[PDB]
Amino acid sequence: EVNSFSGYLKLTDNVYIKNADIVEEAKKVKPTVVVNAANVYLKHGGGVAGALNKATNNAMQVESDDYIATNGPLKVGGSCVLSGHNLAKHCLHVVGPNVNKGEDIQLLKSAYENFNQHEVLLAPLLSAGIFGADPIHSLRVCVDTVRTNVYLAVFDKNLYDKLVSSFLE
Ligand SMILES: CNS(=O)(=O)c1cc2c(N[C@H](c3ccc4c(c3)S(=O)(=O)CCC4)C(C)C)ncnc2[nH]1
């Protein structure tokens, strides 16, 4: 079965959300696209990026290093398409702004705009966690920007409940 997402709550006609680990979702659903919360040099050193790379037994990092050698780094708000390995057909590496490192929160709209080149995506909440953006604001930018079908996996029941309550106000 293709893009077999289960147990999501539909927020809008094209945005769905689940309290789930994106790694486990990717292994079970086998989506056409999984989004990585990347940095500009595609160094998957921790957080969501480190977990997705570890689930590929480091194949994503080796492929990423070869992409950067030939193409140079990404820009904040930009993306590239690489292999999905065992997690998806493709991985869309998207760089959201890291507010904790002084990058502009306005680039979060440009980051979500990359999703619109793909019909269906499994994604994390961009710039949340240690990237420092307000997660309620990241969900609002996602809903306002993405026009294709996005399935957000947020691996924290406390944050999931706060996001659904924020959306339903
Ligand atoms: C890394 N540990 S894990 O168990 O594999 C995992 C964490 C995680 C996860 N965590 C959320 C999250 C969302 C975005 C970003 C991060 C974190 S970050 O801190 O890695 C910086 C990059 C942007 C968190 C808010 C609840 N969301 C979805 N599947 C996940 N899987």
Q: Tell me if 153 CB under 6 Å of ligand 1.
A: yes
Partners of 149 in beta bridges: 120
Look-up of token digits 């539909």: 10
Q: Supply 118's token pair.
A: 């793909």
Give CA–CA dist 34/146, Å, rounded.
Answer: 15
Helix/strand/coil (H, E, C) string of 21-88?
CHHHHHHHHCCCEEEEECCCCCCCCCHHHHHHHHHCCCHHHHHHHHHHHHHCCCCCCCEEEEECCCCC
Give resolution in angstroms.
1.2
Count other C-beta atoms under 10 Å from residue 122's C-beta: 27
First and final C-alpha spacing in the chain:
35
Q: Is 2 helix (H, G, I), strand (E, B) or coil?
A: coil
Where do the domains of the chain lie, and which CATH numbers do they carry? 3-167 (3.40.220.10)
Q: Which residue carries 């269906």 as its tokens? A: 120
Residue 47 burial (CB count, 10 A): 14
Distance CA 16, CA 80 (A): 23
Tokens of 168: 């339903």
Ligand 1, closest atom to CA 50? Answer: 1
Q: How far apart are CA 153 and CA 94, in angstroms?
A: 15
Q: Is 78 in the pocket of ligand 1 (CB under 6 A)?
A: no
Q: Which tokens sit at 39?
A: 């940095």
Ligand 1 centre to CA of 74 (Å) is 21
**Whether 4 contacts 29, CB under 8 Å:** yes
State the pairing for strand pair 120-123/149-154: parallel
Q: How many CB atoms lie within 10 A of CB 169?
A: 4
- DSSP code per residue over 131-144: G---HHHHHHHHHH
Please tell me the residue having the least CA distance from ligand 1 atom 9. Answer: 155
